[PDB]
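Try it yourself: sequence plus zinc ion, in.
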Amino acid sequence: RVTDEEIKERLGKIKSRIAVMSGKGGVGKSTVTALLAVHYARQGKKVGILDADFLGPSIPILFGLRNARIAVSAEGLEPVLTQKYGIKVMSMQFLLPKENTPVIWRGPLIAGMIREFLGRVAWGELDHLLIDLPPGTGDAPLTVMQDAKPTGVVVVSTPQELTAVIVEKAINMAEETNTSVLGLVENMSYFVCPNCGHKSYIFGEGKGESLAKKYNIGFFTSIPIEEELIKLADSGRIEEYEKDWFE
Amino acid sequence: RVTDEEIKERLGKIKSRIAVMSGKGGVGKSTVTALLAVHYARQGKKVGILDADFLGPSIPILFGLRNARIAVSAEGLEPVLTQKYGIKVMSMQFLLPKENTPVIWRGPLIAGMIREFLGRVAWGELDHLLIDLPPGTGDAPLTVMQDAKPTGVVVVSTPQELTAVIVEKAINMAEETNTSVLGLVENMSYFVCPNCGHKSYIFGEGKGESLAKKYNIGFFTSIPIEEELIKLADSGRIEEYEKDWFE
Ligand SMILES: [Zn+2]
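Structure, out:
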């Protein structure tokens, strides 16, 4: 039911709309979206995250949102605040609160909701809204990126699913939506040993910095492989992760 | 068109029909299937692998089968021999040989083919036939496992996607097809540093040996994380991998 003029009126209140994408794999996409959100929240900024990933609700898992209940006020759908930084969150998972396990939704029962979440949710005047797009460069992340009309785009890949085609493909999509790639994050680019500190490229060297230099992306960072990170992300305590790779 | 009496007549010629499965992820399932096949081939046994994974043709990638061409003789569909051990291989990918990139097929256009590959392919008197099932414990791997009527089942998981439910679920499926779980392989259970040799459980400790002890699985092995393995598997040279974790 929601219309463009309604979505535009809502989103306009948001100063920054950063969409996060990745190749078909999408490995680390969501975790990177939370880490980014936590980066800004910890800076004293008002952060909000929208879940648009058809393939399982990662975000609500990373933040341990088991409560997952949707409420509605005069301003619209009420987002669930994160337990530690009060980051606003909206996910498909919240539609069935009494479910203790993640449930994959249908196909068309997503495209519409994402639009309704973009315009009928009370995000408020938060200055940063991260949209966790569904993995891949297909039409799924294209429609979401269009309705969201981001103010910037961030690409998340790995030493294996990171090529100049995935990036150029993201460079096109960014223009096909009056936006642009602002950053590139290479996930699990390497592993630093906790005993002697030696570096190992388990998945190989992603050479993510080269591509960031090729198309001169304004920002680039390589997050490493860490027993802790993975351990916290799975137990839904990413907010407790005491490391900031975006700084 | 193929019928049960035709599939049974073919498979009967095969002494061992080992089906390989895993949780929704299926991470390492295929690579483990090749490593196993290479284990037997290197032992001087006649090995054959059937590709039944709806989600991308891993096997033909692991063995670098770019040629990927299907031929037909008086005995039926001719399998493609591996470049080094002459392991017979049949995959959906071989239907479109002139394609230099893997293409994901539809849904119903798979269930039928797998049956046709099980009975109209010239496997011969090979004593080991490994079926690479599609990931998960859903109906997809159920129908394949029924037509294949394996003589044994192997479960492949990781320190995160390895639970007593996935295994018990595999214990049921095995009985629902007059078969049984013969082994359990834990993939990427740990990483051994090449500098000081210290062990790290990046994805956590899978405790795969505990489960193998719980339901007393006859076989269990933990394959580690290795820069080489991954590097060879991606470049389609798993046959050159000089390590045998099944012994
Ligand atoms: Zn070390």
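One thing you can check immediately is this: Chain B has one domain: 1-247.
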